[PDB]
Amino acid sequence: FDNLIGYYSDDGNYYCVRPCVSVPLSVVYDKTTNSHATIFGSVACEHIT
Amino acid sequence: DVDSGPPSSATSCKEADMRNSSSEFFNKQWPMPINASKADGIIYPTGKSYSNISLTLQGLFPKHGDLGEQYIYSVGHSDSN
Ligand SMILES: *[C@@H]1O[C@H](CO)[C@@H](O[C@@H]2O[C@H](CO)[C@@H](O)[C@H](O)[C@H]2NC(C)=O)[C@H](O)[C@H]1NC(C)=O
Ligand SMILES: *[C@@H]1O[C@H](CO)[C@@H](O[C@@H]2O[C@H](CO)[C@@H](O)[C@H](O)[C@H]2NC(C)=O)[C@H](O)[C@H]1NC(C)=O
Ligand SMILES: *[C@@H]1O[C@H](CO)[C@@H](O)[C@H](O)[C@H]1NC(C)=O
């Protein structure tokens, strides 16, 4: 698709170029108790902290 | 402009033995056609590189099975002894 994938830098290391990504969001909501929680889909907590 | 160096001081040129393409001296035909399965005569893209993909590119490529034109460079006449 003519997008940048790799780059041969001047230091001698090949690198992989990936687009900048954002974590998915899901919100579970309860109307009766008025309480909510968030879900970070398919990502561990060590990436959240 | 750019200086090309000194001109040639030789006032005499050298005689060449001209033979046409059907002079029984240059009609030895080794075909060597273009084979796309070996990627014969493929010019790489100028400022990009690709890895482990197959791509349909539009550009300037030779035809498959093209025999082309064969040119032979010979050695001039010289004395046996
Ligand atoms: C061989 O050819 C080169 C280029 O045709 C000559 O280099 C040029 O030399 C002249 C002086 O005679 C300079 O003014 C040019 O700038 C040179 N050009 C380049 C590209 O180098 C070279 O002199 C020739 N050598 C001999 C022995 O004939
Ligand atoms: C180059 O590409 C081929 C095909 O796209 C890759 O082969 C695949 O490898 C995975 C992982 O082993 C397999 O699950 C697939 O079945 C393979 N597909 C085919 C068609 O063989 C290959 O791994 C790639 N090589 C590199 C170094 O990235
Ligand atoms: C072109 O190359 C492939 C693989 O090297 C070979 O199998 C095929 O015979 C070649 N084509 C011809 C016309 O010889």
Side-chain angles (χ1 to χ4, degrees):
Chain A
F1 285 159
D2 277 352
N3 309 324
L4 189 69
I5 287 299
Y7 177 62
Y8 280 96
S9 172
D10 296 355
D11 46 30
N13 295 347
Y14 178 82
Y15 296 114
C16 293
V17 196
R18 315 207 72 79
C20 296
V21 287
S22 40
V23 283
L25 270 193
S26 301
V27 184
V28 53
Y29 175 58
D30 186 30
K31 192 180 176 47
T32 47
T33 57
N34 182 56
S35 43
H36 84 285
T38 202
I39 307 174
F40 291 103
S42 79
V43 56
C45 295
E46 84 83 18
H47 192 91
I48 308 298
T49 79
Chain B
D1 283 3
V2 183
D3 191 27
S4 45
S8 192
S9 46
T11 187
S12 206
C13 280
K14 287 178 196 304
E15 171 146 30
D17 190 26
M18 256 210 62
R19 304 289 185 97
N20 43 27
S21 298
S22 73
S23 62
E24 51 76 24
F25 263 103
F26 295 92
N27 37 13
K28 324 312 201 303
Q29 290 259 291
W30 311 288
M32 291 265 198
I34 284 295
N35 196 16
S37 316
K38 311 221 191 73
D40 274 348
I42 293 297
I43 291 172
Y44 212 77
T46 320
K48 297 159 299 308
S49 187
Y50 305 98
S51 195
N52 210 6
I53 46 184
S54 300
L55 283 155
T56 292
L57 252 74
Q58 171 90 9
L60 291 179
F61 311 97
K63 291 180 183 302
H64 185 71
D66 204 353
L67 290 178
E69 261 294 300
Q70 171 185 315
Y71 303 88
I72 316 146
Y73 283 168
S74 177
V75 201
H77 291 281
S78 183
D79 241 337
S80 180
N81 31 287

mmCIF file of all heavy atoms in Angstrom, chain A residues 7-47:
data_model
loop_
_atom_site.group_PDB
_atom_site.id
_atom_site.type_symbol
_atom_site.label_atom_id
_atom_site.label_comp_id
_atom_site.label_asym_id
_atom_site.label_seq_id
_atom_site.Cartn_x
_atom_site.Cartn_y
_atom_site.Cartn_z
ATOM 1 N N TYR A 7 13.312 0.866 7.972
ATOM 2 C CA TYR A 7 14.259 1.952 7.766
ATOM 3 C C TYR A 7 15.648 1.505 8.194
ATOM 4 O O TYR A 7 15.818 0.973 9.293
ATOM 5 C CB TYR A 7 13.836 3.202 8.543
ATOM 6 C CG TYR A 7 14.816 4.341 8.426
ATOM 7 C CD1 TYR A 7 15.099 4.912 7.194
ATOM 8 C CD2 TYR A 7 15.457 4.844 9.546
ATOM 9 C CE1 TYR A 7 15.996 5.951 7.082
ATOM 10 C CE2 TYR A 7 16.354 5.884 9.443
ATOM 11 C CZ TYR A 7 16.620 6.433 8.210
ATOM 12 O OH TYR A 7 17.514 7.470 8.105
ATOM 13 N N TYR A 8 16.632 1.727 7.326
ATOM 14 C CA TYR A 8 18.031 1.412 7.605
ATOM 15 C C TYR A 8 18.702 2.686 8.104
ATOM 16 O O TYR A 8 19.036 3.573 7.315
ATOM 17 C CB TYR A 8 18.727 0.874 6.360
ATOM 18 C CG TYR A 8 18.444 -0.580 6.070
ATOM 19 C CD1 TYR A 8 17.447 -0.945 5.178
ATOM 20 C CD2 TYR A 8 19.178 -1.584 6.681
ATOM 21 C CE1 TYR A 8 17.185 -2.270 4.907
ATOM 22 C CE2 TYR A 8 18.923 -2.913 6.416
ATOM 23 C CZ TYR A 8 17.927 -3.249 5.527
ATOM 24 O OH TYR A 8 17.668 -4.571 5.259
ATOM 25 N N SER A 9 18.909 2.775 9.413
ATOM 26 C CA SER A 9 19.424 3.998 10.004
ATOM 27 C C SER A 9 20.935 4.104 9.811
ATOM 28 O O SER A 9 21.606 3.168 9.371
ATOM 29 C CB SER A 9 19.069 4.064 11.485
ATOM 30 O OG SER A 9 19.726 5.151 12.111
ATOM 31 N N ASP A 10 21.468 5.280 10.151
ATOM 32 C CA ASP A 10 22.895 5.533 9.993
ATOM 33 C C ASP A 10 23.736 4.837 11.053
ATOM 34 O O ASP A 10 24.944 4.674 10.855
ATOM 35 C CB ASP A 10 23.171 7.036 10.023
ATOM 36 C CG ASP A 10 22.533 7.766 8.862
ATOM 37 O OD1 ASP A 10 21.956 7.095 7.982
ATOM 38 O OD2 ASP A 10 22.607 9.011 8.829
ATOM 39 N N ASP A 11 23.136 4.429 12.171
ATOM 40 C CA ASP A 11 23.882 3.715 13.200
ATOM 41 C C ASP A 11 24.137 2.257 12.843
ATOM 42 O O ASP A 11 24.934 1.602 13.522
ATOM 43 C CB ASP A 11 23.152 3.805 14.545
ATOM 44 C CG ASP A 11 21.662 3.519 14.435
ATOM 45 O OD1 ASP A 11 21.250 2.736 13.556
ATOM 46 O OD2 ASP A 11 20.894 4.081 15.243
ATOM 47 N N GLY A 12 23.490 1.739 11.805
ATOM 48 C CA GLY A 12 23.668 0.367 11.391
ATOM 49 C C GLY A 12 22.595 -0.598 11.839
ATOM 50 O O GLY A 12 22.761 -1.807 11.646
ATOM 51 N N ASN A 13 21.505 -0.112 12.425
ATOM 52 C CA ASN A 13 20.416 -0.961 12.888
ATOM 53 C C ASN A 13 19.196 -0.771 12.000
ATOM 54 O O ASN A 13 18.797 0.363 11.718
ATOM 55 C CB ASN A 13 20.055 -0.654 14.342
ATOM 56 C CG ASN A 13 21.175 -0.987 15.302
ATOM 57 O OD1 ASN A 13 22.135 -1.667 14.942
ATOM 58 N ND2 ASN A 13 21.056 -0.512 16.536
ATOM 59 N N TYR A 14 18.620 -1.881 11.553
ATOM 60 C CA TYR A 14 17.338 -1.855 10.866
ATOM 61 C C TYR A 14 16.215 -1.695 11.881
ATOM 62 O O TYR A 14 16.253 -2.279 12.967
ATOM 63 C CB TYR A 14 17.147 -3.135 10.056
ATOM 64 C CG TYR A 14 15.829 -3.237 9.325
ATOM 65 C CD1 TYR A 14 15.640 -2.623 8.096
ATOM 66 C CD2 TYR A 14 14.772 -3.956 9.864
ATOM 67 C CE1 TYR A 14 14.433 -2.723 7.428
ATOM 68 C CE2 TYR A 14 13.569 -4.061 9.206
ATOM 69 C CZ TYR A 14 13.404 -3.445 7.990
ATOM 70 O OH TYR A 14 12.197 -3.557 7.346
ATOM 71 N N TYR A 15 15.209 -0.904 11.522
ATOM 72 C CA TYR A 15 14.078 -0.640 12.395
ATOM 73 C C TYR A 15 12.783 -0.949 11.661
ATOM 74 O O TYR A 15 12.735 -0.969 10.430
ATOM 75 C CB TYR A 15 14.074 0.812 12.884
ATOM 76 C CG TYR A 15 15.257 1.157 13.753
ATOM 77 C CD1 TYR A 15 16.206 2.077 13.332
ATOM 78 C CD2 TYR A 15 15.433 0.556 14.991
ATOM 79 C CE1 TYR A 15 17.292 2.392 14.125
ATOM 80 C CE2 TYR A 15 16.515 0.864 15.789
ATOM 81 C CZ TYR A 15 17.441 1.781 15.349
ATOM 82 O OH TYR A 15 18.522 2.094 16.140
ATOM 83 N N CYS A 16 11.733 -1.205 12.434
ATOM 84 C CA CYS A 16 10.397 -1.439 11.903
ATOM 85 C C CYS A 16 9.524 -0.243 12.240
ATOM 86 O O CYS A 16 9.420 0.140 13.407
ATOM 87 C CB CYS A 16 9.783 -2.711 12.487
ATOM 88 S SG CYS A 16 10.582 -4.242 11.989
ATOM 89 N N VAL A 17 8.892 0.337 11.227
ATOM 90 C CA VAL A 17 8.048 1.511 11.403
ATOM 91 C C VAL A 17 6.596 1.058 11.414
ATOM 92 O O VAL A 17 6.106 0.491 10.431
ATOM 93 C CB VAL A 17 8.293 2.552 10.301
ATOM 94 C CG1 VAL A 17 7.716 3.895 10.710
ATOM 95 C CG2 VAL A 17 9.778 2.674 10.011
ATOM 96 N N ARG A 18 5.911 1.305 12.525
ATOM 97 C CA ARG A 18 4.502 0.995 12.672
ATOM 98 C C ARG A 18 3.724 2.265 12.989
ATOM 99 O O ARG A 18 4.256 3.168 13.642
ATOM 100 C CB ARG A 18 4.274 -0.038 13.783
ATOM 101 C CG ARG A 18 5.237 -1.201 13.739
ATOM 102 C CD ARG A 18 4.632 -2.446 14.361
ATOM 103 N NE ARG A 18 3.601 -3.033 13.513
ATOM 104 C CZ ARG A 18 3.841 -3.794 12.454
ATOM 105 N NH1 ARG A 18 5.075 -4.069 12.065
ATOM 106 N NH2 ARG A 18 2.816 -4.289 11.767
ATOM 107 N N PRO A 19 2.479 2.374 12.528
ATOM 108 C CA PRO A 19 1.686 3.570 12.829
ATOM 109 C C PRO A 19 1.378 3.681 14.312
ATOM 110 O O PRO A 19 1.262 2.679 15.023
ATOM 111 C CB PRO A 19 0.405 3.366 12.011
ATOM 112 C CG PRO A 19 0.747 2.328 10.993
ATOM 113 C CD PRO A 19 1.762 1.448 11.637
ATOM 114 N N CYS A 20 1.266 4.923 14.779
ATOM 115 C CA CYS A 20 0.977 5.172 16.184
ATOM 116 C C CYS A 20 -0.438 4.717 16.513
ATOM 117 O O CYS A 20 -1.390 5.030 15.791
ATOM 118 C CB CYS A 20 1.159 6.653 16.510
ATOM 119 S SG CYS A 20 2.861 7.243 16.316
ATOM 120 N N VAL A 21 -0.574 3.976 17.607
ATOM 121 C CA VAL A 21 -1.816 3.295 17.939
ATOM 122 C C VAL A 21 -2.336 3.810 19.272
ATOM 123 O O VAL A 21 -1.578 4.305 20.113
ATOM 124 C CB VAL A 21 -1.621 1.765 17.992
ATOM 125 C CG1 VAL A 21 -1.462 1.210 16.597
ATOM 126 C CG2 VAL A 21 -0.408 1.420 18.833
ATOM 127 N N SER A 22 -3.646 3.689 19.454
ATOM 128 C CA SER A 22 -4.314 4.049 20.693
ATOM 129 C C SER A 22 -5.015 2.822 21.257
ATOM 130 O O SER A 22 -5.486 1.961 20.508
ATOM 131 C CB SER A 22 -5.324 5.178 20.469
ATOM 132 O OG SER A 22 -6.020 5.000 19.249
ATOM 133 N N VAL A 23 -5.062 2.741 22.581
ATOM 134 C CA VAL A 23 -5.672 1.579 23.239
ATOM 135 C C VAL A 23 -7.178 1.599 23.014
ATOM 136 O O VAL A 23 -7.785 2.686 22.997
ATOM 137 C CB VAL A 23 -5.335 1.570 24.731
ATOM 138 C CG1 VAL A 23 -3.912 1.098 24.943
ATOM 139 C CG2 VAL A 23 -5.517 2.954 25.328
ATOM 140 N N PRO A 24 -7.815 0.450 22.811
ATOM 141 C CA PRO A 24 -9.274 0.423 22.691
ATOM 142 C C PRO A 24 -9.944 0.728 24.021
ATOM 143 O O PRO A 24 -9.377 0.541 25.098
ATOM 144 C CB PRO A 24 -9.573 -1.011 22.237
ATOM 145 C CG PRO A 24 -8.262 -1.550 21.750
ATOM 146 C CD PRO A 24 -7.220 -0.872 22.569
ATOM 147 N N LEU A 25 -11.176 1.216 23.928
ATOM 148 C CA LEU A 25 -11.970 1.555 25.097
ATOM 149 C C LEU A 25 -13.322 0.866 25.037
ATOM 150 O O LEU A 25 -13.954 0.807 23.978
ATOM 151 C CB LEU A 25 -12.185 3.061 25.210
ATOM 152 C CG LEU A 25 -11.182 3.895 25.996
ATOM 153 C CD1 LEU A 25 -11.778 5.265 26.236
ATOM 154 C CD2 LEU A 25 -10.853 3.221 27.309
ATOM 155 N N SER A 26 -13.757 0.350 26.180
ATOM 156 C CA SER A 26 -15.117 -0.128 26.363
ATOM 157 C C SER A 26 -15.587 0.307 27.740
ATOM 158 O O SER A 26 -14.821 0.261 28.705
ATOM 159 C CB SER A 26 -15.217 -1.652 26.223
ATOM 160 O OG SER A 26 -14.762 -2.081 24.954
ATOM 161 N N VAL A 27 -16.838 0.746 27.826
ATOM 162 C CA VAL A 27 -17.429 1.203 29.078
ATOM 163 C C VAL A 27 -18.627 0.323 29.382
ATOM 164 O O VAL A 27 -19.577 0.267 28.594
ATOM 165 C CB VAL A 27 -17.851 2.679 29.010
ATOM 166 C CG1 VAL A 27 -18.362 3.145 30.359
ATOM 167 C CG2 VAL A 27 -16.700 3.534 28.553
ATOM 168 N N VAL A 28 -18.590 -0.355 30.524
ATOM 169 C CA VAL A 28 -19.741 -1.088 31.031
ATOM 170 C C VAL A 28 -20.483 -0.182 32.006
ATOM 171 O O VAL A 28 -19.880 0.412 32.907
ATOM 172 C CB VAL A 28 -19.324 -2.432 31.664
ATOM 173 C CG1 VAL A 28 -18.235 -2.267 32.715
ATOM 174 C CG2 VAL A 28 -20.530 -3.141 32.252
ATOM 175 N N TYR A 29 -21.783 -0.021 31.783
ATOM 176 C CA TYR A 29 -22.579 0.966 32.493
ATOM 177 C C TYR A 29 -23.839 0.318 33.042
ATOM 178 O O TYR A 29 -24.455 -0.519 32.380
ATOM 179 C CB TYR A 29 -22.943 2.135 31.567
ATOM 180 C CG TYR A 29 -23.870 3.155 32.183
ATOM 181 C CD1 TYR A 29 -23.525 3.822 33.347
ATOM 182 C CD2 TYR A 29 -25.089 3.453 31.592
ATOM 183 C CE1 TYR A 29 -24.369 4.756 33.911
ATOM 184 C CE2 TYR A 29 -25.942 4.381 32.149
ATOM 185 C CZ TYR A 29 -25.577 5.030 33.307
ATOM 186 O OH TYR A 29 -26.423 5.959 33.864
ATOM 187 N N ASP A 30 -24.208 0.702 34.262
ATOM 188 C CA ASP A 30 -25.433 0.242 34.904
ATOM 189 C C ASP A 30 -26.276 1.459 35.251
ATOM 190 O O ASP A 30 -25.832 2.328 36.009
ATOM 191 C CB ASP A 30 -25.127 -0.578 36.158
ATOM 192 C CG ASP A 30 -26.371 -1.183 36.774
ATOM 193 O OD1 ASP A 30 -27.328 -1.472 36.026
ATOM 194 O OD2 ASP A 30 -26.395 -1.366 38.007
ATOM 195 N N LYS A 31 -27.488 1.519 34.701
ATOM 196 C CA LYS A 31 -28.328 2.698 34.884
ATOM 197 C C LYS A 31 -28.970 2.734 36.265
ATOM 198 O O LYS A 31 -29.140 3.814 36.842
ATOM 199 C CB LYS A 31 -29.403 2.745 33.799
ATOM 200 C CG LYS A 31 -30.151 4.062 33.723
ATOM 201 C CD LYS A 31 -31.192 4.041 32.621
ATOM 202 C CE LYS A 31 -31.998 5.326 32.606
ATOM 203 N NZ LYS A 31 -31.119 6.524 32.694
ATOM 204 N N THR A 32 -29.335 1.569 36.809
ATOM 205 C CA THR A 32 -30.100 1.531 38.052
ATOM 206 C C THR A 32 -29.254 1.956 39.246
ATOM 207 O O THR A 32 -29.687 2.772 40.066
ATOM 208 C CB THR A 32 -30.670 0.131 38.274
ATOM 209 O OG1 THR A 32 -29.642 -0.842 38.050
ATOM 210 C CG2 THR A 32 -31.823 -0.128 37.319
ATOM 211 N N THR A 33 -28.047 1.409 39.365
ATOM 212 C CA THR A 33 -27.165 1.750 40.471
ATOM 213 C C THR A 33 -26.313 2.979 40.194
ATOM 214 O O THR A 33 -25.694 3.498 41.131
ATOM 215 C CB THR A 33 -26.248 0.571 40.807
ATOM 216 O OG1 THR A 33 -25.497 0.200 39.646
ATOM 217 C CG2 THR A 33 -27.065 -0.620 41.275
ATOM 218 N N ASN A 34 -26.294 3.456 38.948
ATOM 219 C CA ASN A 34 -25.449 4.558 38.485
ATOM 220 C C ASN A 34 -23.981 4.282 38.831
ATOM 221 O O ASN A 34 -23.352 4.955 39.649
ATOM 222 C CB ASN A 34 -25.938 5.902 39.043
ATOM 223 C CG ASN A 34 -25.114 7.080 38.555
ATOM 224 O OD1 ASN A 34 -24.962 7.291 37.352
ATOM 225 N ND2 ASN A 34 -24.571 7.851 39.491
ATOM 226 N N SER A 35 -23.460 3.221 38.222
ATOM 227 C CA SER A 35 -22.080 2.810 38.418
ATOM 228 C C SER A 35 -21.518 2.347 37.087
ATOM 229 O O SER A 35 -22.231 1.741 36.282
ATOM 230 C CB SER A 35 -21.965 1.694 39.463
ATOM 231 O OG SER A 35 -22.978 0.721 39.286
ATOM 232 N N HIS A 36 -20.241 2.637 36.857
ATOM 233 C CA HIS A 36 -19.607 2.337 35.585
ATOM 234 C C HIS A 36 -18.183 1.857 35.818
ATOM 235 O O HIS A 36 -17.557 2.162 36.836
ATOM 236 C CB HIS A 36 -19.613 3.559 34.658
ATOM 237 C CG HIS A 36 -18.488 4.513 34.908
ATOM 238 N ND1 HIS A 36 -18.468 5.373 35.985
ATOM 239 C CD2 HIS A 36 -17.346 4.747 34.220
ATOM 240 C CE1 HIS A 36 -17.363 6.094 35.949
ATOM 241 N NE2 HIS A 36 -16.663 5.733 34.888
ATOM 242 N N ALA A 37 -17.682 1.091 34.854
ATOM 243 C CA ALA A 37 -16.300 0.643 34.842
ATOM 244 C C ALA A 37 -15.790 0.689 33.411
ATOM 245 O O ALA A 37 -16.568 0.654 32.455
ATOM 246 C CB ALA A 37 -16.151 -0.767 35.421
ATOM 247 N N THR A 38 -14.473 0.774 33.266
ATOM 248 C CA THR A 38 -13.849 0.839 31.956
ATOM 249 C C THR A 38 -13.156 -0.480 31.637
ATOM 250 O O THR A 38 -12.759 -1.231 32.532
ATOM 251 C CB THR A 38 -12.862 2.016 31.865
ATOM 252 O OG1 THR A 38 -12.653 2.365 30.491
ATOM 253 C CG2 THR A 38 -11.524 1.694 32.508
ATOM 254 N N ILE A 39 -13.072 -0.784 30.344
ATOM 255 C CA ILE A 39 -12.421 -1.991 29.849
ATOM 256 C C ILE A 39 -11.398 -1.575 28.806
ATOM 257 O O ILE A 39 -11.755 -0.960 27.795
ATOM 258 C CB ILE A 39 -13.420 -2.993 29.247
ATOM 259 C CG1 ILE A 39 -14.554 -3.298 30.225
ATOM 260 C CG2 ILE A 39 -12.711 -4.268 28.827
ATOM 261 C CD1 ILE A 39 -15.642 -4.153 29.641
ATOM 262 N N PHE A 40 -10.138 -1.909 29.048
ATOM 263 C CA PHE A 40 -9.066 -1.701 28.080
ATOM 264 C C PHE A 40 -8.897 -3.017 27.330
ATOM 265 O O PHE A 40 -8.234 -3.938 27.813
ATOM 266 C CB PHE A 40 -7.785 -1.266 28.780
ATOM 267 C CG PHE A 40 -7.859 0.106 29.377
ATOM 268 C CD1 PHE A 40 -8.023 0.270 30.741
ATOM 269 C CD2 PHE A 40 -7.776 1.230 28.576
ATOM 270 C CE1 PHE A 40 -8.094 1.530 31.293
ATOM 271 C CE2 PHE A 40 -7.845 2.493 29.127
ATOM 272 C CZ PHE A 40 -8.006 2.640 30.486
ATOM 273 N N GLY A 41 -9.507 -3.101 26.151
ATOM 274 C CA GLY A 41 -9.645 -4.380 25.472
ATOM 275 C C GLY A 41 -8.322 -4.897 24.936
ATOM 276 O O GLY A 41 -7.566 -4.163 24.289
ATOM 277 N N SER A 42 -8.038 -6.172 25.220
ATOM 278 C CA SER A 42 -6.916 -6.928 24.653
ATOM 279 C C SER A 42 -5.560 -6.307 24.977
ATOM 280 O O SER A 42 -4.617 -6.421 24.193
ATOM 281 C CB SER A 42 -7.070 -7.104 23.140
ATOM 282 O OG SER A 42 -6.693 -5.926 22.452
ATOM 283 N N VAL A 43 -5.444 -5.653 26.128
ATOM 284 C CA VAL A 43 -4.189 -5.046 26.558
ATOM 285 C C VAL A 43 -4.042 -5.236 28.064
ATOM 286 O O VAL A 43 -5.012 -5.109 28.818
ATOM 287 C CB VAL A 43 -4.120 -3.560 26.126
ATOM 288 C CG1 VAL A 43 -5.298 -2.777 26.646
ATOM 289 C CG2 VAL A 43 -2.823 -2.913 26.573
ATOM 290 N N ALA A 44 -2.831 -5.587 28.497
ATOM 291 C CA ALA A 44 -2.552 -5.865 29.898
ATOM 292 C C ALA A 44 -2.446 -4.572 30.705
ATOM 293 O O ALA A 44 -2.315 -3.473 30.159
ATOM 294 C CB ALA A 44 -1.269 -6.680 30.033
ATOM 295 N N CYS A 45 -2.501 -4.718 32.034
ATOM 296 C CA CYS A 45 -2.437 -3.559 32.920
ATOM 297 C C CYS A 45 -1.055 -2.919 32.963
ATOM 298 O O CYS A 45 -0.951 -1.732 33.297
ATOM 299 C CB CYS A 45 -2.853 -3.942 34.343
ATOM 300 S SG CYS A 45 -4.571 -4.469 34.565
ATOM 301 N N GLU A 46 0.005 -3.673 32.647
ATOM 302 C CA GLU A 46 1.347 -3.098 32.674
ATOM 303 C C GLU A 46 1.528 -2.059 31.575
ATOM 304 O O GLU A 46 2.378 -1.170 31.696
ATOM 305 C CB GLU A 46 2.403 -4.215 32.597
ATOM 306 C CG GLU A 46 2.801 -4.758 31.208
ATOM 307 C CD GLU A 46 3.858 -3.922 30.488
ATOM 308 O OE1 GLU A 46 4.546 -3.122 31.153
ATOM 309 O OE2 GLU A 46 3.993 -4.067 29.254
ATOM 310 N N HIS A 47 0.751 -2.155 30.499
ATOM 311 C CA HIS A 47 0.680 -1.075 29.528
ATOM 312 C C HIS A 47 -0.233 0.056 29.972
ATOM 313 O O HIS A 47 -0.124 1.168 29.444
ATOM 314 C CB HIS A 47 0.206 -1.623 28.180
ATOM 315 C CG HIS A 47 0.372 -0.666 27.042
ATOM 316 N ND1 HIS A 47 1.503 -0.618 26.259
ATOM 317 C CD2 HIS A 47 -0.469 0.268 26.543
ATOM 318 C CE1 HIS A 47 1.358 0.318 25.339
ATOM 319 N NE2 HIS A 47 0.171 0.870 25.490
#
